Nucleic acid binder design. Sequence first.
RNA 1: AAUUGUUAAGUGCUGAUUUAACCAAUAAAAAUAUAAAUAAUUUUUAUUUGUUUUUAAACACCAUUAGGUAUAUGCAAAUAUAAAAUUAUAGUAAUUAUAGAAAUUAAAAAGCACCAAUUUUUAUAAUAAAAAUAACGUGCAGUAAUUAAUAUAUUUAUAAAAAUAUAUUUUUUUUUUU
Lengths: 48, 214, 96, 99, 26, 65, 82, 159, 222, 52, 283
Amino acid sequence: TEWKLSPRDIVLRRFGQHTKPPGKAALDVGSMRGSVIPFGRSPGEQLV
Amino acid sequence: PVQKKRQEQMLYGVNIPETRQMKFEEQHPLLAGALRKLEGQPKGFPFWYRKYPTRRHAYEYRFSIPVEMLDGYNDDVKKALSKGMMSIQEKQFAQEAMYMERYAEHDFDTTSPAVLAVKRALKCRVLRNHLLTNPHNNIIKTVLANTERKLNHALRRLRKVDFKKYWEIIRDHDVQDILQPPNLVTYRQGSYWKYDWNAGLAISTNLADVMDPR
Amino acid sequence: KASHIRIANRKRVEMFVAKRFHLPTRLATAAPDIAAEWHDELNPMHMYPAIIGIGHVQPVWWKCAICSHSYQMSVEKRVVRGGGCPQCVVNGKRAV
Amino acid sequence: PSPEVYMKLNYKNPATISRFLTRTGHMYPADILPLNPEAVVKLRVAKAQAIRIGLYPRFGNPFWFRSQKFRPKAYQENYDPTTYSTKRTVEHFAYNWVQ
Amino acid sequence: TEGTQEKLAAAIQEHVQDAYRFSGPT
Amino acid sequence: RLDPFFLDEREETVLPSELPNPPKPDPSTPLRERALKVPAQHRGHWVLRDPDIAITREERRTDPW
Amino acid sequence: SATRWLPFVSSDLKDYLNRYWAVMFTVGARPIETGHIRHYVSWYCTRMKVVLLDHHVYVEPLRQQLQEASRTPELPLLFVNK
Amino acid sequence: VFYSFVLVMKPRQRRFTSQALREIGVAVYSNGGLIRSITNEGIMRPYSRFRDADNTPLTYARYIILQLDMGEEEMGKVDKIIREHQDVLMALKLNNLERPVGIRSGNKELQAAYFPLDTFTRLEEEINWSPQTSADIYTQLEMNWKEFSRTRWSSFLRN
Amino acid sequence: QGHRLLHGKREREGSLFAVANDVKRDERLLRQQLNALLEEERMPTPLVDLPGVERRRDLPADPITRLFFQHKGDHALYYGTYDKPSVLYTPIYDFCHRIREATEQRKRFVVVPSTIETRGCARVMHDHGLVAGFRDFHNDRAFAVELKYFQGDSTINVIEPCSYDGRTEFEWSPKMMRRLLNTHGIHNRLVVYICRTADNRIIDHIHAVKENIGGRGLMMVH
Amino acid sequence: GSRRSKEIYIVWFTVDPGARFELEPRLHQLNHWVQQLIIKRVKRRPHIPRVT
Amino acid sequence: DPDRPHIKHIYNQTALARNLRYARYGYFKRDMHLLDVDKLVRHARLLPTPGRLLTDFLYQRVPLPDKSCAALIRYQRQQIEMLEVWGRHASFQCAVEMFERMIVTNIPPVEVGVETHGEMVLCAAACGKWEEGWNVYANRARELEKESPESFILNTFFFDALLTLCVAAGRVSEGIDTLEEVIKRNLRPRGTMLNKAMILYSILGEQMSKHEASRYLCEPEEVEKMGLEVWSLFDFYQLPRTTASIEAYMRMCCAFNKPTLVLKAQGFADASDIRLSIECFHW
RNA sequence: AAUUGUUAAGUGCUGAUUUAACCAAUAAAAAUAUAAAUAAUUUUUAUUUGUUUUUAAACACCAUUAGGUAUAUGCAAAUAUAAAAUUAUAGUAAUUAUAGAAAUUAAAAAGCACCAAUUUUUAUAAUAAAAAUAACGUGCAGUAAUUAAUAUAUUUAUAAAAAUAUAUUUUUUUUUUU
Ligand SMILES: [Zn+2]
C-alpha cells in the first residue's frame, strides 16, 4: 500500500518517542567495592 | 485476550466450540441468537471452502465473507459488505493480509521474519499516524518507541536469514536507511556489527550463491 | 483537558481558537449588511451565516438586495476581496 | 440475568433506567444496590444518552415510585414485612354489592 | 535571512555573560 | 453588548422542586447591590435568583444559599 | 489485589450463609430493629454483613427463602454460622 | 446496523422538515452510503427544552430514528452535516451497534468470544428494545398467529 | 533451490506457531494432544503411561530402569504434566529458592524447573538422602521434589546456590574440590558441594576429588 | 465543638415535635457521611471528630 | 545551521554535552519574530498540530510572510502524505481552516502569496480533490494574479502544483494547457513538470489504446508528435535527466507502442549517470 | 483497574451521587539465560511560572464596596515521581475530654548576629602588598488551657517569622468486606 516511515524521525526521536530505561541494569565495574567470594561471605544465614 | 483477538482476526471459527454456543451467547441468548426462523433459501454445504482456509484469504468483503456466500442477495446487501463499509481494523487487517499473501510460507503461517517485519512496520505506521493527529498521547509514544526497536530487530534478522525478501521490502517501500547505526561512538567500536554475532547470525549467508568463496 | 463551546448551538469548536478566530470572524456578526443578502433557498440548509466564517473560499449563493438577482460568489471574495452583484455592475456602467 | 432487563437497559426505556437510580436520579452505593458489572455500564450510558436527547431529566427521577416494591399502605406511614405473608384467598367469600 | 543579526547579537551577548562569569560575585 | 449565553443555560432544564412553570424573574430587572452573578446551571432554585434573594459576597461567607 | 473489586449478589439464600459469618437481611423502613442488632453484634466485635432488601435485584427470591428458614415474616433476621 | 442517529428536530412546517430529511438522505447517498431505515416518531415534549440558533427555548420536538450503513470518513462527513444543521437541535451517534456495550471494558476473557454478525445483521429495534417489544412478540411471528388470534374476541362481544 | 535457514531453538525444533503472530507462546500441550491424536489402536499394541525414548539406543543401561522406559517413535516427546513455574535469575537459583521456601512451610512436593544441571543436582541430593523422592522426573520442563522429613523438622537445613547474587558464576579447580572436602580442618562428607564437569555430568565434591577433577560450582546443601 | 475538635455536637430540632422520632434514627445513620464530609470539604481540621 | 552544518554529527548522546532535548519545539518559541518556519517544520522535535502551530504564531503576533504560510501548509501537507487513503478529508478540512485563518486575521501581518496557493493545490492533489483544487484555489490564485500584477506572479512552483493536481486527478488536457501557459510565460519549467507532462501523455495514449481496442484529438499518430517533443524540451533549456524522467519517458513510449525508443532510453540512461530504477525494467 | 482524544468520542473541566463510565488508539509477538553491560541516552499525567490585550462574562483574592490581580481552555520552560550508593545524628518531652491529663508516656524530634576549613578588592609609560571577610548550626520572638502536621512553589523584613496555591497523612470499633 505505502510505508511513509522516515528513519530520521525514528533515530532523532520525533513525536517524543520514549523508551523506558531498565531497572538498575547498569552492570559496571567501577561502582563495585566488594570482594566476590563463592557462596557469598555468609552463605547460610538463619533469621532467629 | 491480546492473543485471542489476533486469533479471531486470523482464524474463522475459533470462537465457536463443539457445542455451537458462544460465551456471549450462553449468557445473552436474546441478543446473540437469531430472533426469526425462516424456512427459505438454504445454502447447503460450501464446495468452495478450499480457497479460504484463513481469513487473510478473503479481504474483499466485510467480516471475511467470501464472494460465493453472497449469491442470491440484492445489491444493497452486497454494497453494505463492500470495501467502502469496512472498519479501520478491517482495513488494517486487509493491509496485513496483502503482505501475508506475498511473504507467507504456507496458508496458516504468520511468524515468518518477512511477515513479522512488515507487521511491525504496519504497526509503526499506525502508531505514527495516531501520534500525528494526537501528539499528547503519552502511551502511544512508548508503544511506538518499543515497536520501532522490535521492527529493527525483525528487519535485522530478516537481512541475515533471507536477504532477497529483505532487499525487496527495502526497495519497494522507499525506506533505504531504516537499518542505520544511531551513534558514531558506539559504531566506532564495532558494537553495531556485534549484533550479528550476539544474535547468532554470523554464518547465515550462503557464500556459494553470492560470491566465489575461493 | 480541553474545553469547547458551540457556535450558534451547533458548531463545536475549541474554546481557545474560538475567542481568537472562530467567534469574531463569522458572517452574521462581523458583516451584518453582507449577511443580510444571504440566499435562503438555493443554499444548503446546513449552511447559514451563523456558522459560516468570513474566509469561506467555496462559492455560495447570494440574493441581491438592490435588484432581484441570485448569483454565486465566494464569501472571502465578497468580504475581504470585495464583491458585488454581477447585474448591478453591468447596470452601473450602462447608466454612467 | 433476566432476558428482558439487558435488552431494555437503553435510552428508550425511561423506567428501566429509573429502577436502578435513587430519588434524585443519581447512583446508589454498591453495598445497597449490587448489580451485574455489565448492567452498570449499560445503565450509566443509557442515562446519559436519554438525558442528552431530552428523554430523561438532568435532575430527578420520574419513575421512582413505580420501582419501589416495598410500599406502605394508604392508612400506614411505614412498610411492615408482616403483610407479605397475608395470602388472603377470600376465605370468608366476600361478595361485593356490584356483583 | 533578515533575523540573523539579532541572533548574532544574542549569541555575542551570551558569550559576554560567560566572560562576565570570570568576575564572580557582583 | 455581548454574552447572553454565559449567564444562561444551554438547554432550559426544569427541576422537580419547581413544578410546573418554574418561577423565573425578568432579566431586565437588575439584582441587589454587591450581589453575586451565578450562572443558571449552578443555582439551587430560581427563587434564589430573585434580586431580593440574590446572595452577596458577605452572605456567601456565612450562608451557602 | 489479583481481582478487581465487585459487589456480591446472589439469588439464593445458601450462598449468603456459606460466604459470611454473620448475615442480616433488613428493610429500609425498619431502622430501629436494624440498629439494635448493629449495636449487639458490634459490641462483641463480630464482622457482619447487612443486606438491605430495599433496592435489591432478587427481592422476590429472597423473601420466599427467608420464609422457609424462619417461619415468621419479620425482618431483620440474623444468620450466624449457617 | 452500522450507524444509527436519533435526530431531535424543530417542529417546523412539513416542507422544511421534508427538505431537511431530503438533504440528509442526499448527503448520505452522494457519499456512497445506504439508508437502512428512517422512522418518524412524532412530536413529543422532552424533559429539557433545547435552544435553536436564535436562543429560543422550544417546548416541543420531533424525534427521528435514522439507521445507515456508511463508511467512517463519509459518516464523519454526514455527521458534520447533521450536527451543523439549523433544524437539528441534538443528535447522538450510536456507535455501539456492532459490538454490544460491556464487552470492551467488562471481562477480558469475554472480549473475542462474541459474533459481530449477530448484531450487524439485525435492525436497531432488535438491539435496543422498546418497552412494547418483548420475546413473545418475536415468537408470535413464526407460530402462524393468523389461525390462532381469530377467536380472541369471542367473549367480549356479548358483554 | 534456496531454502530458508532455521534460526533459533524454536525453528530448529520445528514449532508450528499456531497462535497468531506470537513466537514465544508455549507449545507443549497442543503438540502433546496432536501427538496423542496421531497414534491409533492397530487391530490384527498401543503405548503405556511409562516414559519413552525416541531411539532404541537411548534406553538406560540399567536393566531395572529399562523396565520403566519404552520405545516410542515421535510420541516420546512432549512428556510431562507440570509446566515451568514463575514468580528468578538462574534455574539453580530458583531451584534453591523454591526448596528453601517450601521446606519452611512443611510441604510435601516442590515443583522445580527441570534443566540439565537441575535434575542432576536433585539426583545427587537424592543419593545423599536429602530428598525422599521425585515425581515426573522424565519431564524436561519441571519436576516435583518429594521432600524428606524426620521427627517434625526438615532434613534439608541450608540450601544455597553458588551464584549468590544470581549473576556471577564460578569455576572450581580440583584444588577447590580438595578444599571443599577438607574444610575447617575436618573431613567433610556432611555438607554436599555439587559441581558440573566439562563432560556435563553433575558430580558432588567427593567423587570430584576421587577422580581428581573440578567443574562449575552449582550449589551447596546440608 | 471541643477545644481541640476531638468531638463535634450538631444541635438540631424539628418544626413539629411528633416528627422528631421520624428524623431521629436516620440522622444517626449519617455520622460516617458527616466525617467524610469533614475530611473532604474541610481543610485545617485539628482532629477528625466524633459526630454527636 | 541544520541544512549547511559546519560540524559533523550535530547531535550526541554524551553525559554532559547531551543536546537532543534542546532541539525540540519550545526552545525556538523564545524567538518567533526571527524564526524561519521552513527549518522549524523540517528540524524540530515534538511539534504540535499545524493548526496549533498557526495559533501559537498568531498568538505571539509575528508578521508572517508568504514563506511562513507556505511552511505551515507544507506541514499540514506532510501530515496528509503520511496518513492513510481513507483518512484524508479531516486533514484537508484542517488545511482549509488554516487557510481561512491566514486570510481573515490581518493583524499580525499575514499575506497569502503564490506559494501558499501552490501548497493548497498540492494538499488537494494529495487528498485527490479535483473540484476543490482546480475550481476554487487555482481560480482564486488566477484572480489574484490578474487583479494585482507586479506583486502576485505565478512562479514555477504553482504550475508544478497544478501539474501534480492534473496527474493525481487524471485530467490530461488541463495539464498540457498549464505547461503551454508555462511555455508562453517565457519561463523555463522544472524537470518534474516535464515528467508529469509525459505521465499525462502516457495516460492519454493508454486511453486511446483502450478506446481503439474496445471500438480533443481522435488522431493518435499526431499524439506521439506532441509526446516525444516533451522529451525534446529536456535538451531545450538545460533540464538534466533524472530517474523519474526516464520512468515517465519509458511509460510514455510504452503507451505509444514504440519499443525502439524504450531500448534507446535504457541505453541513454547508462550513458551519463541514471540509476536504472527496476520499474524501468518493468517497462 | 490506566493515559490521550483538536481532524475521532463523552462533554457545562464525569468524581456533587458513585469502590462499577459509550466510542477510538494502546495488553503478546529476534536469538540467548548464561551471556559476563544482548538495553536506551528519549517523555511528563503533578506543582508553579511565562506566552496575548474592549480581547474570559462570571466565581475567588490584596488595597475597602469600587479598582486591578489572576483563574479555565491553546502552547511553552523549570522542578518532581522511584529505591540504592556517599556523609553525619543515638534522645526528644507530648497527648485531652458535655474536669481523678491523681492518666499514659524514649518506639532517637536533631545540629540582622555569634564562632580565624577560607574568600573578596586593587597598579593606566612605576606592577603585590595593603585592606576586609572566618566555615557553620541555635538566637531571647512568648501567652490566651494558644496551636493538625509534612512536602513543593511564590510574596512580605515580626525572616530563628508570617501569608497564599496544591498534594499526602492523621478517625477510637454503632458505614462499608473482593
Ligand atoms: Zn444586483
